Design a protein around this nucleic acid. Sequence first.
DNA 1: CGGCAAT
DNA 2: CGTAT
DNA 3: GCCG
Length: 323
Amino acid sequence: MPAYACQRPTPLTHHNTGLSEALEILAEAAGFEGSEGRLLTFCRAASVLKALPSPVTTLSQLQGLPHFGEHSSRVVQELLEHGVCEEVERVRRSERYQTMKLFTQIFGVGVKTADRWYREGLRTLDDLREQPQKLTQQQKAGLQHHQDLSTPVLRSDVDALQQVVEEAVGQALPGATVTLTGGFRRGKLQGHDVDFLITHPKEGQEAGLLPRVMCRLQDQGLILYHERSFCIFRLPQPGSWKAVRVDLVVAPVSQFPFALLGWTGSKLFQRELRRFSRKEKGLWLNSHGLFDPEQKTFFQAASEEDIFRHLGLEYLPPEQRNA
DNA sequence: CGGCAAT
DNA sequence: CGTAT
DNA sequence: GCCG
Ligand SMILES: [Cl-]
Ligand SMILES: [Cl-]
Ligand SMILES: [Cl-]
Ligand code: NA
Ligand code: NA
Ligand code: NA
């Protein structure tokens, strides 16, 4: 199979869930130690298993597979033979991993901040609440709605939110469209947030749209916290409500297919796609466009299909970008 | 060994 | 530093 | 951690 994740279809569900989940724990643990190189490899190795057409049953089936060296193969070997991987289980139990994972999942908290808190003796959320003086407003909101934000967002929630966003956007700018992106566009049934991409058919009209959208959303009393906009929405529930992370992104229609591709993901898929573009095609890709450094020109795109064709890749629908 | 996406 | 895919 |  191809070495780049953007060269292979990766469905949301596959046939090596257990194996890939173990490797991603090591990737997650690697990122907690600042080992971005090791995180990347373990992520790649896990994605390879996701792309396989059938379960891995023997170690010999790992031969030839990209990004599977000594360490990753050792992990799979133990899992196939003993049902568990000793290193993986040791990571799970450790106070370091559980704390870092707990801290980093807080909105407004990254690895660097989490590590510093761990080195100061902080272990729980109430520890962070015990000293609100050294908390930023984004972190204060992160701890404030942490329980709700830790609750999976369902498809039914997305539909309600999109109906809300479309209403505000529509009143903010006639003709402006709202596109669901993120993991939910890839076909996920549950998520930790909702991502929307907003544009307008007439180039330039999308300028200064977000403040108008946010104002009309706040007027409806739907914003607990907030061109991009990282918001925490108040989502109506049966007899109550819960907080939901929502991201609003505005782009000109000329750059829309690039913004759509980037914000649909997955994270690893986009990294592999941009790595492929530069290393194999000598082209520079981001959320805004595709640049030819030699010709000093930007590729024009009307769709995601255009971009894939520019890069010489077979088209992959969003539901096959779950790398 | 240098690179690892990109803003 | 944080945020997004 | 893996790759060229
Ligand atoms: Cl590393
Ligand atoms: Cl899902
Ligand atoms: Cl498109
Ligand atoms: Na976080
Ligand atoms: Na998001
Ligand atoms: Na998301």
